[PDB]
Amino acid sequence: GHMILLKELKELFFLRTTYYLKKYNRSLPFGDMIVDRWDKAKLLGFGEGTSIYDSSIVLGEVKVGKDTWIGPNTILDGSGGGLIIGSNCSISAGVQIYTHDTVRKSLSGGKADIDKASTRIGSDCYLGPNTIIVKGVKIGDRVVVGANSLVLKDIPSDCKVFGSPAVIITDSLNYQR
Amino acid sequence: GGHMILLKELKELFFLRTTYYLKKYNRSLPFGDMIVDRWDKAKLLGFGEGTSIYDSSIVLGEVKVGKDTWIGPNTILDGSGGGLIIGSNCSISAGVQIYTHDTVRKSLSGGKADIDKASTRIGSDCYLGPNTIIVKGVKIGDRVVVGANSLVLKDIPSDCKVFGSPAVIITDSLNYQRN
Amino acid sequence: GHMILLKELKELFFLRTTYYLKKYNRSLPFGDMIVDRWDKAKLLGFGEGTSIYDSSIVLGEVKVGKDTWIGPNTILDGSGGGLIIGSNCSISAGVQIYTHDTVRKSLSGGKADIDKASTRIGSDCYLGPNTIIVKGVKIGDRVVVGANSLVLKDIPSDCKVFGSPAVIITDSLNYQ
Ligand SMILES: CC(=O)SCCNC(=O)CCNC(=O)[C@H](O)C(C)(C)COP(=O)(O)OP(=O)(O)OC[C@H]1O[C@@H](n2cnc3c(N)ncnc32)[C@H](O)[C@@H]1OP(=O)(O)O
Ligand SMILES: CC(=O)SCCNC(=O)CCNC(=O)[C@H](O)C(C)(C)COP(=O)(O)OP(=O)(O)OC[C@H]1O[C@@H](n2cnc3c(N)ncnc32)[C@H](O)[C@@H]1OP(=O)(O)O
Ligand SMILES: CC(C)(COP(=O)(O)OP(=O)(O)OC[C@H]1O[C@@H](n2cnc3c(N)ncnc32)[C@H](O)[C@@H]1OP(=O)(O)O)[C@@H](O)C(=O)NCCC(=O)NCCS
Ligand SMILES: O=S(=O)(O)CCCN1CCN(CCO)CC1
């Protein structure tokens, strides 16, 4: 009964793995072998050519342009005034993008409100693995954010930043040629 | 035959649940989080009232959580090496990993050493920011702020703010508690 | 159909959680209570005793030795000329290991090619939570990489490193 369903789900896992290996030389989570990355993206209203893994969470008002790659284990949170992301962006695995915060709410024992502020990222941006972007941040166009960064403030166009907190290292012109 | 019919059925369920979650709760979740409810999972694991935990969270060994605590996606709660306690009104951000064991010696010795173990505790009224890592043996008090991207290697007293890898005390946390 | 399948998937979740809690003292994501970590590893061609969570992604050519533990929320990317990993390694939760990168492709508006370089990790290595290893890196044997690290350069055998970026701290002889 339930054990038949389990056994069938196990068979589907083995077969879908064999399929993903042969056709796309990859092995993916079960969820990612049911759900299609391009269809999910369409269904959420993102630009054509944009893709999003099953493992990604998308909250509230989020806009994404064309040909933007949204990686696995990502967070796109537009619950706090909307998140807007541009075209041709790389949103690496484990990148988290926020428009709200609950620090005061926790530290006050549940009394204080949630803090909220909108966030926007331009086009032709690269957000390295495990980048955290906090609420109220504006990122310009043609920006590189290195892996593991924590972005607490606006970044101008054509900049490379990294660190916790992220600081401006230099321009990103080299990556554009 | 049935393999592909089940796939179709799962695909149809996914489309219907996504469409549903988009209109009611204004969000799109992983397949797993559309079968498994965050509140029911918390209730089942014995957690306090109003506590919630995503399907993607891993809970190993002895783990207890108080009330009104938010356990985020892609989290690790590892009580396997002597018990993990987390208090009430806590924010456990996405990607936060909390441990009571590790395997460094096991690996480095070619599989011969034991797993090392130590219980871990977090108080009430704490905030652990995205991708915070808490290692075995840590005791965190009440009303602590741990900033994003931190690696906490030692006990943190109540009413403190820390961040960094490894985390250091930056100042007290009293200003965050106000009304 | 749809209501029903939903209802049965829920029932199965409750029943599997109950069984995992009693038998292995754990609660796991839905997908990790379908997929067995040792079977998935075997199917992927990994060595005997290796395990990998459902939540892991493996791209391209990836070779993994015996008795290597591959944790949840991991990325093993061998798409840019192969990733090789040795025996008895701990690949903690959140670790991402790459052989490709798309910085130029994004920053050029989709014009530039994907950059590629093979990556290698020896045996008896520990990679701490959320370690990021970039393309082209060679990690020796018996290396410790501390949590929250970004590995941008080679690491010799018997070394301990950590940081973003990762720097050498000392030898790893104490852990052996
Ligand atoms: C439950 C949920 O999901 S909530 C949503 C997810 N959370 C977020 O997006 C918020 C992420 N931010 C954090 O975790 C932050 O570390 C916080 C909010 C906990 C603390 O930040 P605050 O110190 O209040 O912010 P502020 O910008 O005022 O920073 C003050 C100083 O601390 C530094 N700083 C703050 N947090 C960090 C950090 N995590 N690592 C390093 N430095 C930090 C700032 O660079 C600044 O340095 P300065 O004194 O030289 O100016
Ligand atoms: C199978 C598995 O996945 S196991 C479960 C997950 N693993 C864990 O929870 C353990 C995570 N811990 C780590 O990654 C650690 O970096 C370790 C254990 C590999 C190395 O830690 P050790 O160096 O042995 O610990 P110790 O506390 O002695 O640290 C020595 C010094 O280096 C610093 N240090 C240690 N690890 C790090 C790190 N990852 N980043 C920065 N600094 C670090 C300490 O702050 C300390 O500095 P100090 O001399 O100024 O006080
Ligand atoms: C964006 C990125 C490529 C920048 O790296 P880079 O600057 O080209 O590499 P370099 O070593 O030449 O960078 C120069 C300096 O920045 C430092 N650095 C680079 N990226 C850093 C980061 N994310 N955090 C901290 N320091 C960083 C280097 O250590 C070096 O410091 P130095 O002046 O002391 O020598 C890199 O930060 C990154 O995110 N890499 C991850 C790529 C990946 O695997 N992506 C997933 C697949 S799409
Ligand atoms: O872009 S990915 O690296 O994820 C996949 C690599 C090649 N893919 C190109 C896009 N098609 C589908 C486009 O809709 C699948 C194959």
Structure overview:
It is classed as transferase. The structure is a homotrimer. Chain A has three helices and 17 strands. In chain A, the strands form three sheets. Chain A has a seven-stranded mixed beta sheet with strand order 2-4-6-11-14-16-17. In chain A, strands 3, 5, 7, 10, 12, 13 and 15 form a seven-stranded parallel beta sheet that branches. By secondary structure, chain A is α/β, with parallel strands linked by helices. Chain A folds into two domains: 34 residues; 141 residues, UDP N-Acetylglucosamine Acyltransferase, domain 1 (3 Solenoid). The interface between A and B is large, with 43 and 49 residues. Strand 3 of chain B pairs antiparallel with strand 1 of chain C, so a sheet runs across the interface.
Give the N-terminus to C-terminus distance of chain A in angstroms.
60 Å
Query: Please, what is the oligomeric state?
Result: homotrimer
**CATH topology-level name of the largest domain in chain A:** UDP N-Acetylglucosamine Acyltransferase, domain 1
Approximate strand percentage of chain A? 25-35%
Q: Quickly count the helices of chain A.
A: 3
* Sheet/helix structural class of chain A: alpha/beta
The 3D shape of chain A can be described as: globular
Radius of gyration of chain A: 19 Å
CATH architecture descriptor name of the largest domain in chain A:
3 Solenoid
Number of strands of chain A: 17
Secondary structure: helix percent of chain A: 10-25%
Q: Walk across the major sheet of chain A and give the strand order.
A: 2-4-6-11-14-16-17
For the largest beta-sheet of chain A, the strand count, sense and barrel status come to:
7 strands, mixed
Instruction: Look at the structure and give the CATH class of the largest domain in chain A.
Output: Mainly Beta
CATH superfamily of the largest domain in chain A: Hexapeptide repeat proteins
Our count of domains of chain A comes out at: 2
H/E order of the elements of chain A?
Answer: HEHEEEEEEEHEEEEEEEEE
Question: Largest interface, and how many residues on either side?
Answer: A-B, 43 and 49 residues
What ligand species are in this complex? acetyl coenzyme *A, coenzyme A, 3-[4-(2-hydroxyethyl)piperazin-1-yl]propane-1-sulfonic acid
